[PDB]
Amino acid sequence: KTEWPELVGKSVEEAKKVILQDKPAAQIIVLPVGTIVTMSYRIDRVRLFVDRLDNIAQVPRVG
């Protein structure tokens, strides 16, 4: 599993828990939705983009 569309709209807390069950070594980074980010690709990384309420606002994926 490398994408989690089922997590959109969930809390950032539940998303972290789910992704760490699927990918226990994941380096998770929480960022505000609507920011600009680097375009490196890191198979170990999962960025979580949250809205101002701390809910997931974009499909999480590895990279």
């Binding site: 505000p32 920011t35 600009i36 980010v37 375009m39 690709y41």
Partner: protein, 281 residues
């Protein structure tokens, strides 16, 4: 001894070096996370930070901007790696913080600084899924002002028939760059769509990292600075060519690869780009 990373060879940059052209007097802004100016394989000419809590553009707390800068312009000497345009005047325009992210207004302020400081080339190894009117206006203004603007296409891979190129790469005024490996195969993560313009090496790319280190990174972030460095080589050989002409020269002399949806016009070839007469090889 110095090493020439495979991607520098693959775009035929050594052909320009042997003609005597290495990007001298061409100003390239790396709009990114900063550049570690203490690295012995980089020379940073100037810069500015738009990140409110990280005010020093010559400190790179992420590592990403430093790697991107070395692909553009790592020095020609007896150490480390060689850059595409090793004599270019390199500017650290810091708009991303330690965590690799920045507000749209920070990126825009950086593009404005580049315009005001007469940069010839901007590299933006960065992006997001949505645009804004103000972001489009900033890149359009840079191009109207004569700057070559190059950006990573994005690492969203495929999504059926949909474009997955992000912004600012997706804007017509910006050259959007996808990633291939050493065999010219598209990297599986490389974004796709009719906005994809050209490809460059973006798999296992060795470059400079902060604290006098080197390392291999992957991404359309790594592909973009091959093309920004190529633009600087071309301008050092043809200092009167406009950004329009530099962009056309790179587009018109690619080595065509697959369908343009996945590969754009193909792999850049800076040897062919820097001739007067252009055709694809």
């Amino acid at each position: 001894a110095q090493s020439v990373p495979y991607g520098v060879s693959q775009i035929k940059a050594p052909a320009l070096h042997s003609q005597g052209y290495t990007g001298s007097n061409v100003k390239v802004a790396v709009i990114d996370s900063g550049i570690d100016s203490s690295h012995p394989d980089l020379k940073v000419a100037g810069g500015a930070s738009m990140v409110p809590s990280e005010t020093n553009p010559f400190q790179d707390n992420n590592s990403h901007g430093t790697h991107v800068a070395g692909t553009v312009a790592a020095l020609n000497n007896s150490i480390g790696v060689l850059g595409v345009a090793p004599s270019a005047s390199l500017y650290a325009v810091k708009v991303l913080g330690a965590d690799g992210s920045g507000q749209y207004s920070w990126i825009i302020n950086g593009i404005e600084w580049a315009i005001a400081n007469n940069m010839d080339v901007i590299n933006m190894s960065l992006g997001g899924p949505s645009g804004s009117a103000a972001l489009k206006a900033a890149v359009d203004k840079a191009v109207a002002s004569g700057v070559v603007v190059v950006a990573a296409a994005g690492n969203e891979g495929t999504s059926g028939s949909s474009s997955t190129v992000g912004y600012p790469g997706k804007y017509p005024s910006v050259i959007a760059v996808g990633a291939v490996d050493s065999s010219n195969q598209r990297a599986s993560f490389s974004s796709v769509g009719p906005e994809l313009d050209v490809m460059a090496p973006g798999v296992s790319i060795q470059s400079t990292l902060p604290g006098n280190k080197y390392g291999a990174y992957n991404g359309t972030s790594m592909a973009s600075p091959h093309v920004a460095g190529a633009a600087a080589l071309i301008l050092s050989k043809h200092p009167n060519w406009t950004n329009t002409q530099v962009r056309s020269s790179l587009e018109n002399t690619t080595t065509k690869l697959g369908d343009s949806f996945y590969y754009g016009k193909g792999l850049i070839n800076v040897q062919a780009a820097a001739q007067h007469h252009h055709h694809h090889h």
